[PDB]
Design a protein around this ligand. Structure first.
Ligand SMILES: O=C(O)CNC(=O)c1ncc2c(I)cccc2c1O
Ligand SMILES: [Fe+2]
Length: 211
């Protein structure tokens, strides 16, 4: 579905209402599978880290690697990034009062599927400039009931919580600040995700006064 259409008709209305927005079958099967393969290639080649230390012979969790998008063998990933930027672009000045002028590189995360997950947290608690978190999942035929790895977010100050499964070709958007505390439940199977954070012009500008 047309980026502009999707953005104007779904992402914007949805984001400003729930602060969270899930979009299924974003790029498509062939493309999704393509991204999946490149990601896996990076894993095989050994571009990921050993994983966040969880503990002699300790247990490591999520492994990461930063992808600019033009690295050899990451064309489709670079394509997802550009496609993500396109969506945001159409949401120009539509998401909150924010004015997105930039983003970080892509963070590819891999929970090895050895029980590790990720503690409840807030992506941007100190106002480093990130206003929107964007995550793309590439796990074909994922079954949380079997492999776990659910992403649990606690939107706003509302009771209860929303559960988002790292479904294949799924794209997710959510406020990065205190409004969206979240955690990644233990994953008993390889779980890949690609994350990109979008910067708000003003918040980022005044944050620069730190380096
Ligand atoms: O994978 C998901 O669905 C959700 N991930 C996260 O919230 C998440 N948030 C922050 C993270 C950092 I600073 C570093 C690695 C992984 C990571 C994460 O994976
Ligand atoms: Fe996070």
């Amino acid at each position: 579905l047309p980026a502009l259409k999707l953005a104007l008709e779904y992402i914007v209305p949805c984001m400003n209402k729930h602060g969270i927005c899930v979009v299924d079958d974003f790029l498509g099967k062939e493309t999704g599978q393509q991204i999946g393969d490149e990601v896996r290639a990076l894993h095989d080649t050994g571009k990921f880290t050993d994983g966040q230390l969880v503990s002699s012979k300790d247990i490591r969790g999520d492994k990461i690697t930063w992808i600019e998008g033009k690295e050899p063998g990451c064309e489709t990933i670079g394509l997802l990034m550009s496609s993500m930027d396109d969506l945001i672009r159409h949401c120009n000045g539509k998401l909150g009062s924010y004015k997105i002028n930039g983003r970080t590189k892509a963070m590819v995360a891999c929970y090895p599927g050895n029980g590790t997950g990720y503690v409840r947290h807030v992506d941007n608690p100190n106002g480093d400039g990130r206003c929107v978190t964007c995550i793309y999942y590439l796990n074909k035929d994922w079954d949380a009931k079997v492999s776990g790895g659910i992403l649990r977010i606690f939107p706003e100050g509302k009771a209860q919580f929303a559960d988002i499964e790292p479904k294949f070709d799924r794209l997710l958007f959510f406020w990065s600040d205190r409004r969206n505390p979240h955690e990644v439940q233990p994953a008993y199977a390889t779980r890949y995700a690609i994350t990109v954070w979008y910067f708000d012009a003003d918040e980022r500008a005044r944050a620069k006064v730190k380096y």
